Design a protein around this ligand. Structure first.
Ligand SMILES: [Mg+2]
Ligand SMILES: [Mg+2]
Ligand SMILES: [Mg+2]
Ligand SMILES: [Mg+2]
Ligand SMILES: [Mg+2]
Ligand SMILES: [Mg+2]
Ligand SMILES: [Mg+2]
Ligand SMILES: [Mg+2]
Ligand SMILES: [Mg+2]
Ligand SMILES: [Mg+2]
Ligand SMILES: [Mg+2]
Ligand SMILES: [Mg+2]
Ligand SMILES: [Mg+2]
Ligand SMILES: [Mg+2]
Ligand SMILES: [Mg+2]
Ligand SMILES: [Mg+2]
Ligand SMILES: [Mg+2]
Ligand SMILES: [Mg+2]
Ligand SMILES: [Mg+2]
Ligand SMILES: [Mg+2]
Ligand SMILES: [Mg+2]
Ligand SMILES: [Mg+2]
Ligand SMILES: [Mg+2]
Ligand SMILES: [Mg+2]
Ligand SMILES: [Mg+2]
Ligand SMILES: [Mg+2]
Ligand SMILES: [Mg+2]
Ligand SMILES: [Mg+2]
Ligand SMILES: [Mg+2]
Ligand SMILES: [Mg+2]
Ligand SMILES: [Mg+2]
Ligand SMILES: [Mg+2]
Ligand SMILES: [Mg+2]
Ligand SMILES: [Mg+2]
Ligand SMILES: [Mg+2]
Ligand SMILES: [Mg+2]
Ligand SMILES: [Mg+2]
Ligand SMILES: [Mg+2]
Ligand SMILES: [Mg+2]
Ligand SMILES: [Mg+2]
Ligand SMILES: [Mg+2]
Ligand SMILES: [Mg+2]
Ligand SMILES: [Mg+2]
Ligand SMILES: [Mg+2]
Ligand SMILES: [Mg+2]
Ligand SMILES: [Mg+2]
Ligand SMILES: [Mg+2]
Ligand SMILES: [Mg+2]
Ligand SMILES: [Mg+2]
Ligand SMILES: [Mg+2]
Ligand SMILES: [Mg+2]
Ligand SMILES: [Mg+2]
Ligand SMILES: [Mg+2]
Ligand SMILES: [Mg+2]
Ligand SMILES: [Mg+2]
Ligand SMILES: [Mg+2]
Ligand SMILES: [Mg+2]
Ligand SMILES: [Mg+2]
Ligand SMILES: [Mg+2]
Ligand SMILES: [Mg+2]
Ligand SMILES: [Mg+2]
Ligand SMILES: [Zn+2]
Lengths: 155, 208, 60, 50
RNA sequence: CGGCCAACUACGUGCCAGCAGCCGCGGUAAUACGUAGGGUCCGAGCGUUGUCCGGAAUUACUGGGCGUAAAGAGCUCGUA
RNA sequence: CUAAAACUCAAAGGAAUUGACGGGGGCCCGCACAAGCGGCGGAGCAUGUGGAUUAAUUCGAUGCAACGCGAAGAACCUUACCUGGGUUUGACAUGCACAGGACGCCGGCAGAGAUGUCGGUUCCCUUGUGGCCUGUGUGCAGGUGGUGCAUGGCUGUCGUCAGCUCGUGUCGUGAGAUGUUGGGUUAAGUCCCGCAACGAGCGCAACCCUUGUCUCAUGUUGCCAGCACGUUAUGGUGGGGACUCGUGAGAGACUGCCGGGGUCAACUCGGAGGAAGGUGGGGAUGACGUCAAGUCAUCAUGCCCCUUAUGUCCAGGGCUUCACACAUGCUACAAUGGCCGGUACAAAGGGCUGCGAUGCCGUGAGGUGGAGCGAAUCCUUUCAAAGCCGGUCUCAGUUCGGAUCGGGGUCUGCAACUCGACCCCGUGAAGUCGGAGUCGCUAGUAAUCGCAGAUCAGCAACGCUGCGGUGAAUACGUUCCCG
C-alpha cells in the first residue's frame, strides 16, 4: 500500500443466477475452505427463504442489501492526548461489503437451532426491517449523527 | 559464521571431487579406512607440505596420488620414505597400494603450500608483517595469478589478546560462481598456543 | 569421546542389544547417519572439503 | 544442522544423484560379450552384466 | 636495571604483603612487589633529606598580554 | 567598597574534527500502522524450562538473538551422577631394560558380576631377533577435572538491510575534508546532469538449481494413435512414437516495437505480439565490523590440577522426582457437526541379516506360512483423507468431548515394578469461544484435510524434514505505535 494502490482481483459471476452478489456471499460465508459445502448452504438457505416468503430471491436480496447498506462510518484518532471519534463517508463498494459482513455476522448469532434456517430468517428480518443488521445500522447512523461535531478534522 | 567453504560452494562447477568410486554395501568401511589413512599420512608427514591427496579405488585395488612442492624428501633416492609409507599402508590394510608422486608446476600459486610456509615462518620467529609482505610479493610475481588475500587470527606476538587482520591486493570475487578460487588453510604452532591462517587465490575465469 | 569407551564399544558386547554407532572419525554417540557411518559435523566437513564421493549442495 | 550445540534455526541440505542407464543388447555374440568383459571403465561408472 | 633514563631472565605471594620524582604498577601466568643470578653507573666513597640558582620568555627594561582561555573600571568632569 | 592566610588538587581551560544521541527538522522504506482472515492468553493432554525436594535427579544454554534448545530416539550400554564389590605401567598405544616362548582362543566350578581356579591348542622366522603379550619398573598411558575474560575451527543476530574503503590530486598546520555533496530516477553507492576531482576494490545485478512453453534425439520394467488374440483382470499378450512419461541438446524477455511525458538523458504511464513485461515464481548466495555473543561435553590446543586417584570393570538406582510458575504444540468446546452404509480423484520417498504377497485363525493388536525384490517390474493396500449420495441425533454437559482410575491379551527385548508402545472392556471428570495484553499472514497466500523419510529391534514423535487435496477476504492512505 505504501508504494500505491494494489490491483483488485477480477471476481467471476455466478452461473446459476448471474449475480456476483451470490458469489460474494458464498465467499464471505466460506469457513475452513469448503467451497462446495458453503455453496450448498447458500443455495439451501435461499430456497428456504424463497419458499417461506413466496417472492423472488434475488429481488428480496437486493431489497435487504439496499435497506441495510450504510452511508457514514466512524473513525478513531487521538489529538492532544485525547482520543476522539471522527465520522467520514464510505464508498458504495465498501458499503456493500460491510452490509454483507454484517448480514453474515448477525446470522451467526441467532437461536433457531439450525444455521440453514437462521440465515434465511435473518435475510427475511433484514428485508422487513426487523433485522439485527438493521439495528446495527441504526446504531451506526446514531453514533455518526451524535459525533459528527468533530467533522472539521476531515481525516 | 560468516562465509561458507569456497571449495564446497563451487564443487559442482569449477572444482571436482578429491576421490571418486562407487560403493554401497561397504561404503562405511571405505570411508573409515580412507579417513584413517589420510590422518596417518597427515601425522607422519610434516616436513614436506602435501598440497593435495587423491585416492582412486576400483574393486580391491586402491590407487593413491600425492602432490608435493618437492619430492626430494617425500620419496628418497633409495626409497626410505617410500617403503616406510608402503609399510604403513600395509599395516592399515589397504590391500595392494600404488604410490604416485607428482610435483606441482608452481609452488607459490598453490594455496596450501603458501599456507604451510607462512605458518612455519610465523611459528619459528618471523614477524607477521614481513611474512605477509613477502608472501604477497612472491604470489603476485607469477603472471597467472590475478588476485590474492591472506588472513590470520589468534595470539599475534604473544599479546594477551586476539587480533584478526588481513591484506588484500587484486580481485577476490567470492560471490561470483564463474570465478575460480583456490581455498586453503593451516594451523601454525607456537609456544603460546595455536594460530590459524587462511588464504584466497583468484586465478582467471572459466567459460564452458 | 573417551578412547577407553570408544574402544570398549568397538569390542564385541556380551549381548546383541548393547551395540550402537559411535561415529568413527570422532566417536560422537548422538546424531549419526547409518549409511555413511559419520555424524553431522563430520559429514559437513567431508562434504565441504569435497572428499566424499557423491555429496553436493542441494538447491531445487 | 548448521552448527553444533543448539542454534537449530539454520540448517543445510545435501543431495546425492545417481544416474542409471539401460543398454538392452540383443543377439549376444560371444565376441561382443568378451569385448564387454575386457573393456575397462572408470571407477565412477559401475557395469552390471545380467 | 616500565618511559623520561646507559642497564634482563627465572623463582615466591596475587586489589593481600608492597614500590614510586611525574606518568603509574599487583583481582593466578609482574622485565614496575621480595628473592636469585646476569647487566649498567659509581668507588674510598655510594645513596636519602634540607637550602639557593638555571631550564621558567613562569613579573617578560634587554624579553608577555586583556572578543571567546586571567585580565578594559558603568560613563563623565577634573588636582598632582 | 578596599581585601588576606592555612589546606587540597596534576588538572581546570579556549578553538575546532569523526561518531553517538534528541520526547529537533526535512526526505524515504518494511505485514509497522490502517482495512481483513485465522490464532495465543480460559479446560484436558504431549514436550522444554524455572522453582522445592532427593544420595544422585550428569553438563551447557538464560530478552530480542535460550526455553518440541545440544538429545535424528535415557530397562542394560547410552551416562560423564548416587550406592556397593574389585582393579592396578593400568581398559587402551609406544621406547628402554630385567625373566619367556606364548599371547591369544574354546568349556567346567564359585560369585550381583566384574573377576579367581581348573579342562584343550600354542608360537611364524632363525640364532640376531622382529610380531605378541604374561610379571618388576623405567619413561608413560589415563582425565566429559578447571580456564570460550588466553586461543583454533564452527554458528546466530544487527540484515539479505545497502553500505564500507583505497591509489593520485587538491584545501587546511592539525585532528582532517573532496571524491561519497545538489536535482531527477530505481528494489539497490543502479544510472544521467555540473561541480577539484580523476579511477579502482569489497558489496548490488548477472554467471548456478528448480518451476512455466516449444523444437530435435528418444521406446523398456513406461504410454497407446491405428491393426489381431484376450473373454473377465486390467496393454494382459503380438505390435507401434502418432502425444504425456522419464533424461540429453537447443530456442524463448532484451523496454523487443508503438504513442505521451521527460534536459533528448536516465526513467516512467498506456498499447500490440507473446506462456509470461518491465528483477515471471522460489531456492543456494551473509561486505568491513558490533554483541569479550554460544561452544575447553565433536575435535584440536597454552597453563594449573588427580596419578594409587577426580583413571578403570561390573550389579542396582537416577537423568521420567512435586503443594507451584512460564513457553511451544495436539484434542475440543458441537448441526459448515458426531456416528453408520455406498462411492472417485495425487505427489514424492524406502526396502539385506530388510520390505513383506495369497491363504488360514483371531473384534484387533497380532499367531502360521511366506511368492516377488538389492528393486519404473515386488511390498509400502488398486497411496489415501476432506469430497458426493442415504439414515439417526433436535440443542442436553449431549450419540460432542476424551483424560483419570480397574479387569484381560499381542508384539521386540537375557532384561517392561521406578520405566515403552499397541489391542479388548468398565470408568465419564474440567471445558458453552474466553480479562487487560499479545502473535502469524498480501496468492496458489490464509485456513482446513492426508502421505513418506532421517535417528530406530521395541518406542515417550502431537517434534523436524519433505510431498500433496479443497482453497478465501482486504489494502482508502502514511496523522499516530516499532525498526
Ligand atoms: Mg539401541
Ligand atoms: Mg549420532
Ligand atoms: Mg625498563
Ligand atoms: Mg633503556
Ligand atoms: Mg626499587
Ligand atoms: Mg607469577
Ligand atoms: Mg622491585
Ligand atoms: Mg646485577
Ligand atoms: Mg678519591
Ligand atoms: Mg635563564
Ligand atoms: Mg642548562
Ligand atoms: Mg626568568
Ligand atoms: Mg602568557
Ligand atoms: Mg588593547
Ligand atoms: Mg575568560
Ligand atoms: Mg566588565
Ligand atoms: Mg566600558
Ligand atoms: Mg580629565
Ligand atoms: Mg567547546
Ligand atoms: Mg543529536
Ligand atoms: Mg512484504
Ligand atoms: Mg491491526
Ligand atoms: Mg490458545
Ligand atoms: Mg493456555
Ligand atoms: Mg508437544
Ligand atoms: Mg539441567
Ligand atoms: Mg520459552
Ligand atoms: Mg526461558
Ligand atoms: Mg523448534
Ligand atoms: Mg550399568
Ligand atoms: Mg582436559
Ligand atoms: Mg581431571
Ligand atoms: Mg567442564
Ligand atoms: Mg558459557
Ligand atoms: Mg547498520
Ligand atoms: Mg599542505
Ligand atoms: Mg563532507
Ligand atoms: Mg562523486
Ligand atoms: Mg557513506
Ligand atoms: Mg566524507
Ligand atoms: Mg556499487
Ligand atoms: Mg547477487
Ligand atoms: Mg495401448
Ligand atoms: Mg559485517
Ligand atoms: Mg565469550
Ligand atoms: Mg561471554
Ligand atoms: Mg583444544
Ligand atoms: Mg571417573
Ligand atoms: Mg539416569
Ligand atoms: Mg530431562
Ligand atoms: Mg483435532
Ligand atoms: Mg465412509
Ligand atoms: Mg480377523
Ligand atoms: Mg480405497
Ligand atoms: Mg466422551
Ligand atoms: Mg472426537
Ligand atoms: Mg466446562
Ligand atoms: Mg450451554
Ligand atoms: Mg480484549
Ligand atoms: Mg521410534
Ligand atoms: Mg500442501
Ligand atoms: Zn563424527
Amino acid at each position: 500500500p505504501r508504494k500505491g494502490p494494489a490491483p483488485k482481483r477480477p471476481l467471476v459471476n455466478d452461473p446459476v443466477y448471474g449475480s456476483q452478489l451470490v458469489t460474494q456471499l458464498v465467499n464471505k460465508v466460506l469457513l475452513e475452505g469448503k467451497k462446495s459445502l458453503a455453496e450448498r448452504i447458500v443455495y439451501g438457505a435461499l430456497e428456504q427463504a424463497r419458499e417461506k416468503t413466496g417472492t423472488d430471491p434475488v429481488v428480496t436480496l437486493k431489497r435487504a442489501l439496499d435497506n441495510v447498506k450504510p452511508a457514514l462510518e466512524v473513525r478513531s484518532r487521538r489529538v492532544g492526548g485525547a482520543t476522539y471519534q471522527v465520522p467520514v463517508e464510505v464508498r458504495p463498494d465498501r458499503s456493500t461489503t460491510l452490509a454483507l459482513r454484517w448480514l453474515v455476522n448477525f446470522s451467526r448469532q441467532r437461536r433457531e437451532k439450525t444455521m440453514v434456517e437462521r440465515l434465511a430468517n435473518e435475510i427475511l428480518d433484514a428485508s422487513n426491517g426487523l433485522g439485527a443488521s438493521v439495528k446495527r445500522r441504526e446504531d451506526t447512523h446514531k453514533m455518526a449523527e451524535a459525533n459528527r461535531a468533530f467533522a472539521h478534522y476531515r481525516w | 559464521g560468516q562465509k561458507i567453504n569456497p571449495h564446497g560452494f563451487r564443487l559442482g562447477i569449477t572444482t571436482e571431487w578429491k576421490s571418486r568410486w562407487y560403493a554401497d554395501k561397504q561404503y562405511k568401511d571405505y570411508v573409515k579406512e580412507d579417513v584413517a589413512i589420510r590422518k596417518l599420512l597427515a601425522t607422519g608427514l610434516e616436513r614436506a607440505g602435501i598440497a593435495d591427496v587423491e585416492i582412486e579405488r576400483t574393486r580391491d585395488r586402491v590407487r593413491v596420488d600425492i602432490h608435493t612442492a618437492r619430492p626430494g624428501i617425500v620419496i628418497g633416492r633409495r626409497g626410505t620414505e617410500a617403503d616406510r609409507i608402503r609399510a604403513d599402508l600395509e599395516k592399515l590394510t589397504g590391500k595392494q597400494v600404488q604410490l604416485n608422486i607428482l610435483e606441482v608446476k608452481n609452488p607459490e600459486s598453490q594455496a596450501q603450500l603458501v599456507a604451510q610456509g607462512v605458518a612455519e615462518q610465523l611459528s619459528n620467529r618471523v614477524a607477521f608483517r614481513r611474512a605477509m609482505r613477502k608472501a604477497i610479493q612472491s604470489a603476485m610475481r607469477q603472471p597467472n595469478v590475478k588476485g590474492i588475500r591472506v588472513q590470520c587470527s589468534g595470539r599475534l606476538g604473544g599479546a594477551e589478546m586476539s587480533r584478526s587482520e588481513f591484506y588484500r591486493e587484486g580481485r577476490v570475487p567470492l560471490h561470483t560462481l564463474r570465478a575460480d578460487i583456490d581455498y586453503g588453510l593451516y594451523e601454525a604452532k607456537t609456544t603460546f598456543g595455536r594460530i590459524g591462517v587462511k588464504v584466497w587465490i583468484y586465478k582467471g575465469d572459466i567459460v564452458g | 569421546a573417551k578412547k577407553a569407551l570408544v574402544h570398549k564399544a568397538n569390542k564385541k558386547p556380551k549381548f546383541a542389544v548393547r551395540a550402537y554407532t559411535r561415529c568413527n572419525k570422532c566417536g560422537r554417540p548422538h546424531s549419526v547417519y547409518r549409511k555413511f557411518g559419520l555424524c553431522r559435523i563430520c559429514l559437513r566437513e567431508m562434504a565441504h572439503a569435497g572428499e566424499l564421493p557423491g555429496v553436493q549442495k542441494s538447491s531445487w | 544442522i548448521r552448527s553444533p550445540h543448539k542454534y537449530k534455526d539454520s540448517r543445510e541440505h545435501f543431495e546425492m544423484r545417481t544416474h542409471k542407464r539401460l543398454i538392452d543388447i540383443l543377439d549376444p555374440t560371444p565376441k561382443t560379450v568378451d569385448a564387454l568383459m575386457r573393456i575397462d571403465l572408470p571407477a565412477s561408472v559401475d557395469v552390471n552384466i545380467q
